[PDB]
């Protein structure tokens, strides 16, 4: 029977995988009445989630139960899911009709709006699989969630009652018209990511995060700055005290785009050591379903996971197929990541939404082993490799620029070219080439020393250092450098690559490198990340050109 008293698992009778509470079984595999077994009843209903006004600001567990006890013993802020309505049946929501009696609707059609928080307008949609005519629609006014707000007559004549919320099975991906090819970058405002290791809207990203590599900071930067309207965050149980910081500090966190509380565009799914192992398995399906629901409205959603240890827990089996553990994890994680994407949503109007997945992978269990690695190597398209040595050298964000990668560079380049700068791809490739040349040089120098370096090679190291310090390094704590707009990124890059071109030109005309290193403009370039006016940054190109001219006219 295994872990039973406070669990959720429901495979003890005859048929395969099922789940429930107090042996009251919900469906994933087909049921056949009162199952031959123990006291077990059955509901016919599936492992599902409730989707409507009430999701935002809320903290749930892996099956969308709101979290209870603040504290009971010396353990402050230790919580689990209490059996209660996922959406407050108590509160009145302001409904605004966007459809009229007589209108033809299909699944995904928006029939009303509800201002949920001061940030997010909740779009009231027709549930998937419901078609027909609005024969009845609520007027503008305040309604609780159970109140019928519209009636639809299907083509059969069957009358369907629509509320402000809908239900969806957590293990079935919410349908859409078309999954669009990766195309539009999810702009993080972090230079090293947007430039060298871009995330696409609808893309899949992992963050390998060894202890003490600035993971929390990076995660926070991504959550608050990425141009997704809604964040679905899964974790808060990786550190023993993580739940306390989340319960105490999360309502204090600000969305810097609006000034309003960040919690007003966020939904939290908490996984902890006290919670049943089954409410941690289903957790990522609960999260992605809720993410899918918001993209169906036309929002870009960021699904962020930082729940490696509590999620990675194992469970024993005896029967024949047990087909392996590294394959039990491989089919599971793939079907999760498979649900990421930018889509043409359901609805009569042309509409687009996305779920971008950013999954933290930080194992305190030794190394990045098979329980995390090459079961994903195909499916995750971007890796931001946090590096403890880089953190020790105080290079922040501590993203290793040699072991990180994105397979979205070619997918997003046209967006950058068309909207921001026609030379974006040429410039990042050039900058990367320089960083890779630097890396090769540093290794040769380690072996043989820097004494016999020619001017040209010294120049390359000089400019690579400027790239690392003036561009790759970014200050999350600074009021200006905490976010770098696309136009600032390309302009800083131009400044730097122009300085490179002029440096190599100068060496090639007999100018000594010491003269180039002491150039006044160099140190202004060192501070351009702190400048908010992009035209002042841009002016450094002409300033660079002119100071190099003075060097040329005194030499040749």
Swiss-Prot record:
Pfam families: ATP-synt_ab, ATP-synt_ab_N, ATP-synt_ab_Xtn, ATP-synt_VA_C, Intein_splicing. Keywords: ATP synthesis, ATP-binding, Autocatalytic cleavage, Cell membrane, Endonuclease, Hydrogen ion transport, Hydrolase, Intron homing, Ion transport, Membrane, Nuclease, Nucleotide-binding, Protein splicing, Translocase, Transport. It catalyses: ATP + H2O + 4 H(+)(in) = ADP + phosphate + 5 H(+)(out). One of its GO terms (cellular component) is plasma membrane. InterPro entries: ATP-synt_VA_C, ATP-synth_a_Xtn, ATP_synth_asu-like_sf, ATPase_a/bsu_AS, ATPase_F1/V1/A1_a/bsu_N, ATPase_F1/V1/A1_a/bsu_N_sf, ATPase_F1/V1/A1_a/bsu_nucl-bd, ATPase_F1/V1_b/a_C. GO terms for molecular function: ATP binding; endonuclease activity; proton-transporting ATP synthase activity, rotational mechanism; proton-transporting ATPase activity, rotational mechanism. It is found in: Cell membrane. This protein undergoes a protein self splicing that involves a post-translational excision of the VDE intervening region (intein) followed by peptide ligation. The keyword Ribonucleoprotein does not apply. It comes from the Archaea. GO terms for biological process: intein-mediated protein splicing; intron homing; proton motive force-driven plasma membrane ATP synthesis. Its main location: membrane. Component of the A-type ATP synthase that produces ATP from ADP in the presence of a proton gradient across the membrane. The A chain is the catalytic subunit. PANTHER family: H(+)-TRANSPORTING TWO-SECTOR ATPASE, V-TYPE PROTON ATPASE CATALYTIC SUBUNIT A. NCBIfam families: intein_Cterm, intein_Nterm, PRK04192.1. The intein interrupts the ATP-binding site. Has multiple subunits with at least A(3), B(3), C, D, E, F, H, I and proteolipid K(x). This is A-type ATP synthase subunit A. It comes from Pyrococcus horikoshii (strain ATCC 700860 / DSM 12428 / JCM 9974 / NBRC 100139 / OT-3). The gene is atpA.
